[PDB]
UniProtKB/Swiss-Prot annotation, chain A:
Pfam assignment, any one: ribosomal_L24
Protein name from the UniProt record: Large ribosomal subunit protein uL24
Entry GO terms, CC: ribonucleoprotein complex; ribosome
InterPro entries registered for this protein in UniProt: KOW, Rib_uL2_dom2, Ribosomal_uL24, Ribosomal_uL24_CS, Ribosomal_uL24_KOW, Translation_prot_SH3-like_sf
Gene this chain is encoded by: rplX
From Swiss-Prot, chain B:
Gene Ontology cellular component annotations, sorted alphabetically: cytosolic large ribosomal subunit
Gene Ontology biological process terms from the UniProt entry: translation
Molecular function terms from GO: structural constituent of ribosome
Name of the gene this protein is made from: rpmI
Record carries keyword Ribonucleoprotein: yes
The protein's name in its UniProt record: Large ribosomal subunit protein bL35
Family designation: Belongs to the bacterial ribosomal protein bL35 family.
Gene3D superfamilies assigned: 4.10.410.60
InterPro entries in UniProt: Ribosomal_bL35 (IPR001706), Ribosomal_bL35-like (IPR021137), Ribosomal_bL35_CS (IPR018265), Ribosomal_bL35_sf (IPR037229)
Curated annotation (Swiss-Prot), chain C:
Designated name of the protein: Large ribosomal subunit protein uL4
Family from the record: Belongs to the universal ribosomal protein uL4 family.
Lineage of producing organism: Bacteria, Thermotogati, Deinococcota, Deinococci, Thermales
Disulfide bonds: none
Protein purpose: One of the primary rRNA binding proteins, this protein initially binds near the 5'-end of the 23S rRNA. It is important during the early stages of 50S assembly. It makes multiple contacts with different domains of the 23S rRNA in the assembled 50S subunit and ribosome. Forms part of the polypeptide exit tunnel.
NCBIfam families for this protein: rplD_bact
GO CC terms: ribonucleoprotein complex; ribosome
Keywords: Ribonucleoprotein, Ribosomal protein, RNA-binding, rRNA-binding
SUPFAM superfamilies on file: Ribosomal protein L4 (SSF52166)
GO BP annotation list: translation
Subunit structure: Part of the 50S ribosomal subunit.
UniProt entry tagged with the keyword Phosphoprotein: no
GO molecular function, one term: rRNA binding
Gene name linked to the record: rplD
InterPro entries from the UniProt entry: Ribosomal_uL4, Ribosomal_uL4-like, Ribosomal_uL4_dom_sf
Curated annotation (Swiss-Prot), chain D:
SUBUNIT field: Part of the 50S ribosomal subunit.
Transmembrane segments: none
Gene Ontology MF, one: structural constituent of ribosome
Protein name, entry field: Large ribosomal subunit protein uL15
Encoding gene per record: rplO
Length: 100, 63, 202, 146
RNA sequence: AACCUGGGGAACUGAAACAUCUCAGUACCCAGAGGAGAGGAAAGAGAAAUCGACUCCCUGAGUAGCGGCGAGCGAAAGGGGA
RNA sequence: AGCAGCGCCAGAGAGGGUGAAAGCCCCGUAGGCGAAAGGUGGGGGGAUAGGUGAGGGUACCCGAGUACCCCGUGGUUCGUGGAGCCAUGGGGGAAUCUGGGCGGACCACCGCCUAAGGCUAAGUACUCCGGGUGACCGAUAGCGCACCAGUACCGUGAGGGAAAGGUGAAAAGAACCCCGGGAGGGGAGUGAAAUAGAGCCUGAAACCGUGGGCUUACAAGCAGUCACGGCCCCGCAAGGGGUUGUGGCGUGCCUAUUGAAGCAUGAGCCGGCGACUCACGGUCGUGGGCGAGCUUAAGCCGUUGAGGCGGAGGCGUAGGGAAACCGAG
């Protein structure tokens, strides 16, 4: 509980470091470590693989998780904080001064 | 906590208004048998002490 | 001294006062110390060789053992052992004579007034608890914020204003204490609060 | 005035002495050097020699006690008419206790040195010599009775 | 866990030995109570023709007094409070 | 998130986090909403149980092995004291208001209170549990336990009882090649950094080792010091650093002692742990407030690192005497 945070799976800006300014859809959000997967921090793992099955695993430079604080959601206007407004029934979240 | 007054010494020693300590003359109750009228009279009055006067002061302190 | 600056919608009518002249630096200190000592909380505590988990058994015979010579491990010379004169909880406060509490209080205010920083205001355009308002009022009041200010006043709304403002410390009328006074560079207090200050001393 | 430089005015000086150092008070305690300086000597003020304490003196004090204890008897407070003459009007036990030198003491008894101002002085007892001073310019209101 | 009440109840130690005394009705064993427990509406206090259940704090007071009148031990009424 | 530039919020500039030092990036903070369900709840309201009178006659009742007395003891400040009051193990043993207990033996007087049946909230104590705060600790500290500890291990048992925290921002945790059986290395590669490489931050000291400089096989020593000389090393020189050839001189440290280099004590060496404190009262000194006055204690009100109120009480203004008493004596 309460583990919830900023955004989810969608479009987001990265105000981090090595990938400052960059923008992209967050393909994953792991709340346990409070980090999210975007398209920015992607480092090269040399490892063949941890599990012997499937001989070739990948020298892949796949996406590395990223602290969920350096990424900010976004809308028609670039990079915005997140207010929330209760709809005529449900509970939707408007941006700095617009909708959704 | 709270020093207790030494009752045994209050019961036998009054401190003067200045700071002196007075008490009755010793040896007048028992040894007696027939001593010069001078003795028993000299023994009637009270006296002042010296150094231990300060010792005994440090008991009747709350007093 | 006497003549204190006063501020009102009508203008800067400079009034006067009755506060003493001689400021005893030391006396002031005593009172500041006293405030800071009463607030202390004797929360610091350690466990004596007595209050400690270990047993009581003598560790060795003490004879033809060839070892040193000991009792229980709880002994202070025994890493893990009890502490020697380690702090226990205790009260750090005392009753500083009332006469002095008043003396210092006057002298503090008096001092701040003699430097010419005591401003007795009255006009408060700051209608509600809105920092902006007070920030404006103070701007036109000569309080650019280049100086720490002990704003004393009865109005809880005026509080709301300077409350969050960093370079300012709000405070109730009876809250007057030499510490917060001396603490700040400027002192500004409502005339109604100056009346209650006058009640304790004036 | 700022927080710097209010410090104690050159004589508070919490300079407590530290006995384990190596210069000043050193190997032994502040003073010690011997034995039976280790945990505590007898009293010794009122007490120790080992011989008959100076308790050789003797209790003359009679009435020194009794089982049920103290007897409830009226306590007379000596109040000099010198301090009495200080203020002026009509001195009664009420006034002297309200502010002065009574302190709820059971009774009042004016007396002694000083010069008597003209006024009624209600007390519970008057010194023979005290009755003269006030008689020579005032009234002598004695105590109650019932 | 500790707090509480009742039944039973030490010694070291202090007294610069020690036996009364002190440590202490403490340590502890036991029975019981509960968010508390105990106490509680006078066959009271005690000197004021006064007070007005009980408990708790401040004071009274290291007073009164007890005491191999040693070491030590140590109330109550009354007054200010909850 | 530093620094420079231009802004903005603030009933919120407590704090924590984010690759380093952010009011405005994230979680919060100020301010403000909220329970179908369970618990709590006279605070507000309602209801019931219950209770409420004047004068006169009668003298029926008003707590029994009880009061009371005596023997033995306990409790209280009370240690047998002149020894009451309360309680009661043993023996004797009443009365019902013309009754009966108490006011420190006992008696009379005056006054107090109604024993021998029971119940009663609050104020009070504590802290296993939750939270908040710290001129509290920071892994030899702090709880015995920051870590799968009342564990391992020890003891028949009761019981005793440890050690042990930290890669980095991210695992990116080092594919592939080379030596090797492996372990471990060497390249390569990641990383800001790899003597941050995995019980991995920093990484001190004792202790072991490799390389270099000065030095030593006719020499006698608490191991140093003073001098001169030689060799090497920083600077042009003047100077300074290192080393030791010869000469002069020279009885370890601590403790304890009349006396120790002592053939008196203690110490293998290094690192860490380790001993004059606090509470109340007292006495002298000292800084300051007030002054024949000075000062508050619980507590109440305020505050949430604010004070104020509260004179009950204490010390002081008179002493002397065992006391009655007297009083500048
Ligand atoms: Mg598959
Ligand atoms: Mg491959
Ligand atoms: Mg004299
Ligand atoms: Mg005789
Ligand atoms: Mg004879
Ligand atoms: Mg003769
Ligand atoms: Mg004679
Ligand atoms: Mg006294
Ligand atoms: Mg123990
Ligand atoms: Mg244990
Ligand atoms: Mg022991
Ligand atoms: Mg034992
Ligand atoms: Mg032996
Ligand atoms: Mg040995
Ligand atoms: Mg230790
Ligand atoms: Mg340990
Ligand atoms: Mg250990
Ligand atoms: Mg410890
Ligand atoms: Mg207070
Ligand atoms: Mg502020
Ligand atoms: Mg010295
Ligand atoms: Mg000493
Ligand atoms: Mg000892
Ligand atoms: Mg001793
Ligand atoms: Mg001795
Ligand atoms: Mg002898
Ligand atoms: Mg004994
Ligand atoms: Mg003795
Ligand atoms: Mg013996
Ligand atoms: Mg006892
Ligand atoms: Mg008992
Ligand atoms: Mg309660
Ligand atoms: Mg109860
Ligand atoms: Mg009850
Ligand atoms: Mg009861
Ligand atoms: Mg009961
Ligand atoms: Mg009672
Ligand atoms: Mg209490
Ligand atoms: Mg007291
Ligand atoms: Mg006694
Ligand atoms: Mg006793
Ligand atoms: Mg006792
Ligand atoms: Mg009372
Ligand atoms: Mg009361
Ligand atoms: Mg800087
Ligand atoms: Mg705040
Ligand atoms: Mg900064
Ligand atoms: Mg921040
Ligand atoms: Mg909130
Ligand atoms: Mg809701
Ligand atoms: Mg609600
Ligand atoms: Mg209930
Ligand atoms: Mg209910
Ligand atoms: Mg409800
Ligand atoms: Mg209630
Ligand atoms: Mg009804
Ligand atoms: Mg009627
Ligand atoms: Mg009749
Ligand atoms: Mg009859
Ligand atoms: Mg009948
Ligand atoms: Mg009948
Ligand atoms: Mg019955
Ligand atoms: Mg009786
Ligand atoms: Mg007894
Ligand atoms: Mg008895
Ligand atoms: Mg007893
Ligand atoms: Mg007792
Ligand atoms: Mg006896
Ligand atoms: Mg009986
Ligand atoms: Mg009858
Ligand atoms: Mg009848
Ligand atoms: Mg009858
Ligand atoms: Mg009748
Ligand atoms: Mg009858
Ligand atoms: Mg009597
Ligand atoms: Mg009568
Ligand atoms: Mg009575
Ligand atoms: Mg009854
Ligand atoms: Mg209660
Ligand atoms: Mg807790
Ligand atoms: Mg360690
Ligand atoms: Mg360590
Ligand atoms: Mg744990
Ligand atoms: Mg874990
Ligand atoms: Mg072990
Ligand atoms: Mg075994
Ligand atoms: Mg052990
Ligand atoms: Mg790291
Ligand atoms: Mg890891
Ligand atoms: Mg990890
Ligand atoms: Mg390896
Ligand atoms: Mg490499
Ligand atoms: Mg490298
Ligand atoms: Mg390497
Ligand atoms: Mg190195
Ligand atoms: Mg490193
Ligand atoms: Mg390596
Ligand atoms: Mg390895
Ligand atoms: Mg780090
Ligand atoms: Mg080694
Ligand atoms: Mg070796
Ligand atoms: Mg040689
Ligand atoms: Mg050159
Ligand atoms: Mg030079
Ligand atoms: Mg030489
Ligand atoms: Mg000597
Ligand atoms: Mg030798
Ligand atoms: Mg020997
Ligand atoms: Mg020896
Ligand atoms: Mg030694
Ligand atoms: Mg040896
Ligand atoms: Mg050693
Ligand atoms: Mg006290
Ligand atoms: Mg002291
Ligand atoms: Mg003196
Ligand atoms: Mg002093
Ligand atoms: Mg001076
Ligand atoms: Mg005052
Ligand atoms: Mg107190
Ligand atoms: Mg109020
Ligand atoms: Mg409050
Ligand atoms: Mg505040
Ligand atoms: Mg006096
Ligand atoms: Mg004279």
């Amino acid at each position: 509980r309460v583990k919830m945070h900023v955004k989810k799976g969608d479009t987001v800006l990265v105000a981090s470091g090595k990938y400052k300014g960059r923008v992209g859809k967050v393909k994953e959000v792991l709340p346990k470590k409070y980090a999210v997967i975007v398209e920015g921090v992607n480092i090269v793992k040399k490892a063949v693989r941890v599990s012997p099955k499937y001989p070739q695993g990948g020298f892949i430079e796949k996406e590395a998780p990223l602290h969920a604080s350096k990424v900010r959601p976004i809308c028609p206007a670039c990079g915005k904080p997140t207010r929330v407004r209760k709809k005529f029934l449900e509970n939707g979240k408007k941006i700095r001064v617009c909708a959704k | 906590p709270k020093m207790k007054t030494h009752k045994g010494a209050k019961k036998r020693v009054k401190i003067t208004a200045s700071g002196k300590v007075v008490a009755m003359k010793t040896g007048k109750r028992h040894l007696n048998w027939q001593k010069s009228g001078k003795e028993i009279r000299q023994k009637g009055r009270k006296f002042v002490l010296a150094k231990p006067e300060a010792e005994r002061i440090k008991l009747l302190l709350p007093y | 001294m006497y003549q204190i600056p006063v501020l009102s919608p009508s203008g800067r009518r400079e009034l006067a006062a009755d506060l003493p002249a001689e400021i005893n630096p030391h006396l002031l200190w005593e009172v500041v110390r006293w405030q800071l000592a009463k607030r202390r909380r004797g929360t610091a505590s350690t466990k004596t060789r007595g209050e400690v988990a270990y047993s009581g058994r003598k560790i060795w015979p003490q004879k033809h053992t060839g070892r040193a010579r000991h009792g229980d491990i709880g002994a202070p010379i025994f890493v893990g052992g009890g502490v020697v004169f380690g702090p226990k909880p205790r009260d750090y406060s005392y009753t500083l004579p009332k006469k002095v509490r008043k003396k210092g209080l006057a002298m503090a205010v008096a001092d701040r007034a003699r430097e010419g920083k005591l401003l007795l205001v009255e006009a408060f355009a700051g209608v509600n608890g809105k920092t902006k308002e007070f920030l404006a009022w103070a701007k036109e009041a000569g309080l650019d914020g280049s100086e720490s200010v002990l704003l004393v006043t009865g109005n809880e709304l005026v509080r709301r204003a300077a409350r969050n403002l960093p370079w300012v410390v709000t405070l109730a009328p009876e809250g007057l204490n030499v510490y917060d006074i001396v603490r700040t560079e400027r002192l500004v207090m409502d005339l109604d609060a100056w009346e209650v200050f006058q009640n304790r001393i004036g | 005035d700022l927080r710097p430089n209010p410090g104690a005015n050159k004589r508070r000086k919490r300079v407590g002495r530290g006995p384990g150092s190596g210069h000043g008070k050193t190997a032994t305690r502040g003073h010690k050097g011997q034995k039976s300086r280790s945990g505590g000597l007898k009293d010794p003020r009122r007490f120790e020699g080992g011989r008959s304490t100076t308790l050789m003196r003797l209790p003359k004090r009679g009435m020194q006690g009794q089982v049920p204890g103290e007897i409830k008897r009226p306590r007379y407070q000596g109040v000099n008419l010198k301090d009495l003459a200080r203020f002026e009007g009509e001195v009664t036990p009420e006034l002297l206790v309200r502010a002065g030198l009574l302190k709820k003491g059971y009774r009042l008894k004016i007396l002694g040195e000083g010069e008597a101002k003209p006024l009624k002085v209600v007390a519970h007892a008057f010194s023979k010599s005290a009755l003269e001073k006030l008689k020579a310019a005032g009234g002598e209101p004695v105590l109650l009775e019932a």
